[PDB]
Design a protein. Structure first.
Lengths: 546, 546
């Protein structure tokens, strides 16, 4: 029974193969066929390329050795190398043309999800070229989806030498019959076959995956679209900033580039952005996913006034000051979305761009108190249940697992009313004791929220709703303003509280507003439709926030 | 007795003043003298500019209102505004010309160091211009040196209204006679004077500082060159990455731009980079100051082999992987400097550029064991004292305060021998029980190192020296390589162990090597000569690492 799958990089996980590109360069330069391969392989196990692949010399040390082999080959073939001949240029182009073979990576991901140990085994070099970052980025994106990365130049061995196969087996902690090995080089499969491993010669991706599908008995081709990459909390970089003596803010950080600050809703976590964090970092952004004040590993002071928007926004400004950031792109959802609009209104100099999921820009009504506004808008009547300190805390804290399983559901899986919360005296009054698990979440994901809420519970989170008068008076100071910085409003078709029509007057305040809209999406946008959220955010960030 | 000092931004902490620039624009556009000031002030307390300064409208909303005032003013003056007339362009140039008035900031810093509460009180706007980051960066650099920043547009009041002065006094928690107020606008001093504050009209910086020096009785002009900005540990963003099940690495992070990873020496801390962190962040870099493995808040496993260079380098690579960084600039000192050369040799694709303070690139001698090498080089004989587990730990842990006060001294303050450590049986055998405090450090800084070392002590730090054979065998694999990525070697004149001459053969291995050299500098480079270290590193980063 197969338990491990090994992939080569060049010609397998990354396409085109370097020598595929070079065959075309050879033809374009009108060189004799095979001259570059011949000069590359010159001396075989005793040659310059074996020294390179074993890590004895760097790629920059190897370049002139390859140039000399090309001259020797051309002299013997009685041909002249062209005037502009440069191994540096030729190899730079071949390395840069190489991109992840997405169907191959998808198959490796499916196998690992099904319990396989996966590895990359590659003949590679120590890259010290001025352009080395390109290949470093590619390797970084690939390696994180595998249990092991074995590089010839780091282990001092190369394929097809038999010792590297014994090293692979030792690394995998598996017998050869438990391994499936994929390579586009027939001579590199021979030692693996020799030991008793299943081997697949990768000539074309589709045929190779068909052989892999048959031997593993796992569907790899024609599969449903996979979810974006998620986060394992224990593998993230965790950051902590004290904004004031009693308040520290926790965040998860990933990537490099413009800072993108993600602000979750109620009652959530930095983990609500799990499908966005890897995607936004891969897209070229430095992601800062907050635990907002009152949540997770951030401080949760008991006082209501610690959660008014003016205080919360001031603290987010301090957060940027202490990290040494003049600006960040602010992306919010739900209560986070409300906060980000207000960051754009009061601190535009610190906000590079602003985006909200579901929450429209809600201006203060100077002619009505927030309680009179709730009276005139009964879709928000449930917020009255959140007013009295202790009442909603008692219901939400009674059974954390039940709380999160009842809340985090798709539009069609709703177990909550919302419209009759006050009349019924609670959120879960007509909800089951043991709700089924939504198709959106796994039991493990639910238990992470349960664990997070065991620290401070719901007092801090509910206090976000307990500052209506303070928030109203503060928001009234901004009534003569317009939001003129780059802005995106994303609506969700099936959010029955934050309906898309609630955002219809936003252009009155934000004239240059850009929009996104997600079909068949409920309230929990990030986990309901992660692929769609990612596409919308990346397109907008790349056009408006760079 | 004066206890607080208040500074204006425009024309005081930042020069030139906006209207200084505009006087020149007026003349260049051949406009009637005072037309821009007149259109700017139009309507006084009821005008567009008062609304802007109170935060009622944003700068972008104000721009066309100012344009209309300019048209009204030109019509009345019977003049035509030029064809190319643009308030947007005119104001963008004036805002961008404004730079920190370094002598004024220096004086504010001296007063705060002497116990004054300091504040910035400014007539400012909500900046939503596409170019707003310029001013956001300036305000960010300035505000962090002050106890308070009071902005007209955030408080809804403007100078010279009397209420803003009462607000200032409430914020300061001081009586008016305890305050010195500096402003370049005479009408803005009148309400402060009216309340009983000391006022200084800032016409020229030198004269204003002379008045300030006389009234406070504190020397502000002609002072010695101040030290660079340091770090207060409780105000930094602290980051934590698990690199493997039992190992977590702690770092302090500040700034945005290319990642710069700072690697301290033995027996140090992230805090050894305190004078570099703010300077490198201000210079346009994202600084990651490590607690290296075995130190501070990073893990300190007991096993010797956990501290061999191969393991330490692999972990730093994992650190980059988990943070989502394809590369970082690696800057090391002492043991950190040794590690960074090896990162450049084994992982060039992950190293954007490399710099070492004091530690030359030390290649392995394949013909001698590291013990035979120490026998032939007695300057390193003291390292034999570090070999036996427990011996050096007992001496270094006996009295932490004595340990750090004896080690951290200028070249001329040495209390250690080094050349007779083995013969004498310890580092502090002929050192006083109560050493004096070096001119390099304060008691508070010493106590931070004492606190850090109470967690894990010296076992992990000393284990860095206990892997000579493993490190030698690993380093031998790199003997055919050259370091061809951007590299800087900084020598210290008076480091009597890591002498500048020890770096003399480095060009044999690093042909494109760049150099720095610091006169009258001992071993503890970062704190001995911080201004010089900062100048050298920033110049090199800006030329070779961007
Ligand atoms: O690894 C290869 N060659 C090795 C070198 C040279 C020789 C033979 C082996 C072992 C050595 O020790 C000696 C080091 C090798 C062999 N064939 C192909 N392409 C094939 C697929 C398409 O075109 C041919 N590509 C490579 C490298 C993979 C990354 C860059 C090229
Ligand atoms: O209360 C909500 N959001 C906040 C309100 C309204 C808006 C957005 C934020 C911040 C506000 O300031 C403005 C106050 C809110 C909004 N929409 C939904 N959609 C439900 C549909 C089914 O699942 C949840 N649910 C909630 C709560 C989340 C759990 C219990 C109800
Ligand atoms: O939904 C509103 N306010 C919020 C509700 C009720 C209150 C106050 C805020 C925050 C809440 O949490 C509590 C949720 C609300 C209230 N009044 C008006 N317009 C008014 C002016 C013209 O006609 C009515 N508009 C809105 C939304 C903004 C555009 C479409 C609807
Ligand atoms: O704050 C100023 N004016 C105020 C506006 C307009 C008027 C008068 C006050 C109070 C207002 O409410 C009404 C708002 C004001 C006054 N004088 C000068 N420059 C001086 C130094 C060099 O040139 C003149 N500069 C300013 C501003 C400081 C930043 C941008 C210009
Ligand atoms: O041991 C040192 N550094 C390491 C050695 C030598 C070099 C650099 C690192 C890493 C090595 O691998 C290579 C091993 C080392 C180097 N120079 C000095 N200069 C003294 C002068 C007065 O103050 C300290 N001091 C030390 C120790 C620091 C406290 C006790 C002695
Ligand atoms: O200092 C050396 N090695 C280190 C010392 C001794 C041992 C080994 C390393 C690391 C230590 O921690 C322990 C400190 C050392 C040893 N041997 C040689 N060259 C040899 C080849 C030609 O002549 C001698 N060169 C050096 C330095 C590199 C250039 C100038 C001096």
């Amino acid at each position: 029974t197969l338990r491990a799958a090994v992939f080569d990089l060049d010609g397998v996980l990354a396409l085109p193969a370097v020598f595929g590109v070079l065959g075309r360069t050879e033809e374009a330069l009108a060189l004799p066929r095979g001259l570059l391969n011949d000069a590359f392989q010159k001396g075989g196990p005793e040659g310059a390329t074996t020294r390179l692949m074993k890590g004895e010399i760097t790629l920059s040390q190897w370049i002139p050795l390859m140039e000399e082999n090309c001259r020797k080959c051309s002299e013997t073939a009685k041909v002249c190398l062209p005037k502009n001949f440069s191994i540096k240029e030729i190899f730079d182009k071949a390395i840069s043309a190489r991109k992840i073979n997405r169907p191959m990576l998808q198959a490796a991901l499916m196998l690992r999800k099904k319990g396989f140990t996966t590895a990359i085994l590659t003949n590679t070099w120590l890259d010290d070229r001025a352009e080395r970052d390109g290949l470093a980025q590619l390797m970084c994106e690939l390696k994180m989806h595998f249990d092991f990365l074995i590089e010839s130049c780091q282990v001092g061995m190369v394929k097809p030498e038999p010792q590297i196969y014994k090293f692979l087996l030792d690394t995998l902690k598996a017998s050869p019959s438990e391994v499936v090995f994929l390579d586009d080089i027939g001579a590199n499969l021979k030692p693996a076959r020799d030991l008793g491993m299943v081997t697949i010669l990768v000539q074309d991706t589709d045929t190779a995956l068909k052989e892999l599908e048959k031997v593993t008995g796992i569907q790899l081709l024609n599969t449903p679209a996979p979810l974006p990459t998620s986060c394992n909390p224990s593998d993230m970089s965790h950051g902590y900033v004290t904004v004031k003596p009693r308040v520290r803010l926790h965040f998860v950080e990933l990537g490099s580039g413009p800072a993108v600050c993600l602000c979750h809703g109620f009652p959530e976590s930095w983990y609500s952005w799990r499908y966005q964090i890897p995607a936004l970092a891969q897209a070229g952004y430095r992601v800062l996913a907050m635990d907002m004040k009152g949540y997770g590993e951030s401080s949760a002071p008991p006082e209501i006034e610690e959660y008014c928007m003016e205080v919360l926004c001031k603290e987010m400004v301090t957060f940027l000051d202490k990290l040494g950031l003049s600006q960040a792109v602010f992306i919010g959802h739900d209560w986070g979305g409300m906060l980000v609009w207000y960051m754009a209104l009061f601190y535009p100099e610190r906000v590079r761009a602003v985006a909200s999921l579901n929450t429209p820009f809600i201006p203060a009504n100077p002619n009505m108190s927030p309680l009179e506004s709730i009276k005139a808008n009964p879709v928000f009547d449930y917020q009255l249940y959140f007013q009295e300190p202790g009442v909603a805390e008692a219901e939400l804290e009674q059974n954390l697992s039940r709380t999160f399983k009842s809340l985090f559901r798709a539009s069609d899986e709703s177990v909550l009313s919302m419209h009759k919360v006050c009349e019924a005296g609670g959120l879960f009054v007509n909800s089951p004791e043991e709700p089924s698990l939504s198709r959106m979440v796994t039991e493990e994901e639910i238990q992470f929220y349960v664990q997070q809420f065991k620290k401070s519970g719901f007092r801090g989170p509910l206090n976000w709703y307990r500052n209506m008068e303070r928030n109203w008076k503060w928001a009234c100071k901004s009534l003569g303003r317009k939001i003129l910085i780059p802005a995106l409003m994303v609506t969700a078709e099936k959010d029955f509280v934050l309906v898309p029509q609630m955002s219809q007057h936003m252009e009155d305040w934000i004239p240059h507003l850009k929009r996104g809209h997600i079909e068949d999406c409920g309230h929990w946008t990030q986990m309901d439709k992660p692929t769609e959220v990612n596409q919308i955010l990346i397109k907008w960030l790349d056009s408006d926030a760079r």
